[PDB]
Design an enzyme around this catalytic site. Sequence first.
Site, PDB file in Angstrom:
ATOM      1  N   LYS A  47       0.857  -1.170   0.000  1.00  0.00           N
ATOM      2  CA  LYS A  47       0.000   0.000   0.000  1.00  0.00           C
ATOM      3  C   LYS A  47       0.891   1.215   0.000  1.00  0.00           C
ATOM      4  O   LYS A  47       1.556   1.491   1.001  1.00  0.00           O
ATOM      5  CB  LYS A  47      -0.957   0.001   1.214  1.00  0.00           C
ATOM      6  CG  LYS A  47      -2.121   0.979   1.065  1.00  0.00           C
ATOM      7  CD  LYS A  47      -2.403   1.764   2.356  1.00  0.00           C
ATOM      8  CE  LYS A  47      -3.280   1.029   3.355  1.00  0.00           C
ATOM      9  NZ  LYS A  47      -3.647   1.882   4.511  1.00  0.00           N
ATOM     10  N   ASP A 134     -13.730   2.639  11.531  1.00  0.00           N
ATOM     11  CA  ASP A 134     -14.140   2.571  10.126  1.00  0.00           C
ATOM     12  C   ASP A 134     -14.526   1.149   9.703  1.00  0.00           C
ATOM     13  O   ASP A 134     -14.020   0.627   8.697  1.00  0.00           O
ATOM     14  CB  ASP A 134     -13.074   3.201   9.205  1.00  0.00           C
ATOM     15  CG  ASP A 134     -13.603   3.708   7.868  1.00  0.00           C
ATOM     16  OD1 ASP A 134     -14.846   3.821   7.716  1.00  0.00           O
ATOM     17  OD2 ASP A 134     -12.773   4.028   6.985  1.00  0.00           O
ATOM     18  N   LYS A 136     -16.566  -1.459   7.921  1.00  0.00           N
ATOM     19  CA  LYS A 136     -17.326  -1.523   6.675  1.00  0.00           C
ATOM     20  C   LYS A 136     -16.857  -2.724   5.853  1.00  0.00           C
ATOM     21  O   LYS A 136     -15.757  -3.233   6.082  1.00  0.00           O
ATOM     22  CB  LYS A 136     -17.210  -0.204   5.875  1.00  0.00           C
ATOM     23  CG  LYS A 136     -15.811   0.235   5.483  1.00  0.00           C
ATOM     24  CD  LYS A 136     -15.894   1.548   4.743  1.00  0.00           C
ATOM     25  CE  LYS A 136     -14.545   2.056   4.320  1.00  0.00           C
ATOM     26  NZ  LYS A 136     -14.667   3.313   3.535  1.00  0.00           N
TER      27      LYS A 136
HETATM   28  C1  LIG Z   1     -11.538  -1.823  -5.014  1.00  0.00           C
HETATM   29  N1  LIG Z   1     -11.098  -3.206  -4.743  1.00  0.00           N
HETATM   30  C2  LIG Z   1     -10.562  -3.883  -5.958  1.00  0.00           C
HETATM   31  C3  LIG Z   1     -10.177  -3.284  -3.571  1.00  0.00           C
HETATM   32  C4  LIG Z   1      -8.764  -2.690  -3.835  1.00  0.00           C
HETATM   33  C5  LIG Z   1      -7.893  -2.755  -2.576  1.00  0.00           C
HETATM   34  C6  LIG Z   1      -7.810  -4.189  -2.034  1.00  0.00           C
HETATM   35  N2  LIG Z   1      -6.897  -4.227  -0.899  1.00  0.00           N
HETATM   36  C7  LIG Z   1      -6.109  -5.307  -0.584  1.00  0.00           C
HETATM   37  N3  LIG Z   1      -6.087  -6.358  -1.422  1.00  0.00           N
HETATM   38  C8  LIG Z   1      -5.351  -7.421  -1.086  1.00  0.00           C
HETATM   39  N4  LIG Z   1      -4.609  -7.584  -0.009  1.00  0.00           N
HETATM   40  C9  LIG Z   1      -4.652  -6.518   0.822  1.00  0.00           C
HETATM   41  S1  LIG Z   1      -3.803  -6.477   2.348  1.00  0.00           S
HETATM   42  C10 LIG Z   1      -4.384  -4.867   2.646  1.00  0.00           C
HETATM   43  C11 LIG Z   1      -5.215  -4.379   1.700  1.00  0.00           C
HETATM   44  C12 LIG Z   1      -5.368  -5.339   0.617  1.00  0.00           C
HETATM   45  C13 LIG Z   1      -5.634  -2.958   2.083  1.00  0.00           C
HETATM   46  C14 LIG Z   1      -5.160  -2.789   3.548  1.00  0.00           C
HETATM   47  C15 LIG Z   1      -4.208  -3.972   3.857  1.00  0.00           C
HETATM   48  C16 LIG Z   1      -9.213  -4.731  -1.656  1.00  0.00           C
HETATM   49  C17 LIG Z   1     -10.134  -4.686  -2.896  1.00  0.00           C
END
Ligand SMILES: CN(C)[C@H]1CC[C@H](Nc2ncnc3sc4c(c23)CCC4)CC1
Length: 273
Positions: A47, A134, A136
């Site tokens: 991220k 938060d 959700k």
């Molecule tokens: C809009 N969509 C496609 C979203 C895009 C962001 C996705 N985020 C993640 N995807 C996979 N692994 C991880 S670990 C982690 C996160 C995350 C965010 C915080 C810590 C969730 C689906």
Amino acid sequence: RFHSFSFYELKNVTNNFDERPISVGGNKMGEGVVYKGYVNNTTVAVKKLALKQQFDQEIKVMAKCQHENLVELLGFSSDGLCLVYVYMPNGSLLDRLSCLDGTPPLSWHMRCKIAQGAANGINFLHENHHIHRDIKSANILLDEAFTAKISDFGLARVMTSRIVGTTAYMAPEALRGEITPKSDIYSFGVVLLEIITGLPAVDEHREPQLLLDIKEEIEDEEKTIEDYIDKKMNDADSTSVEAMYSVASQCLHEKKNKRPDIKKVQQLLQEMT
Ligand SMILES: CN(C)[C@H]1CC[C@H](Nc2ncnc3sc4c(c23)CCC4)CC1
């Protein structure tokens, strides 16, 4: 504790932060921006933050809270801000409920396990005296076995001058500036309604616009929970759906003291199955 990554390491493993989606051969999972990475045979979620206090708070909470239903932080980068996590291949619960990118609808069986998992995650946070702020469906991630993992502890923590969170999920007192673990209960109630209905918390082109208002229509006998059950399921039974709705209804009490604590929510969801 956590691995200290240099920005150059995360730059390379994400193929120079390839902003193209995964489907077109890029590295973007979605939106900071989340990128898929590969470090020492392991798939990671990087991220890239686009703010410093939320970076510090995320590291602080992650170091203290390690659980099966919480997303795991592997490391970070601050030289020249990145957060490295265990990659969640099945994205968020919001995306899976909306069947984003052609994914099949979640069955009632899967939905019950997700609700239980998410409640176990919130329980651990509350036992460790942390308020998420938060809660959700977009903050409930799904691993390779569709196990629920609560994410985004950037706003994790009484009154405040800076009201933060998602309006459609927020408790009345949370919109008023109060900080209480009872606000997380209310937000989880909205998530349970999203699980039962397959409908987003807010839809501007919908009547009613807000999902929590369906609780009023059911209580006023204008509609039933049966009318709102996601039609994209073939395995839902009336008893367990009514049992999950009863938990959601209890969570969505306007008076914060009348809401059950997370331990009771966890208890009622286990009794449901
Ligand atoms: C809009 N969509 C496609 C979203 C895009 C962001 C996705 N985020 C993640 N995807 C996979 N692994 C991880 S670990 C982690 C996160 C995350 C965010 C915080 C810590 C969730 C689906």
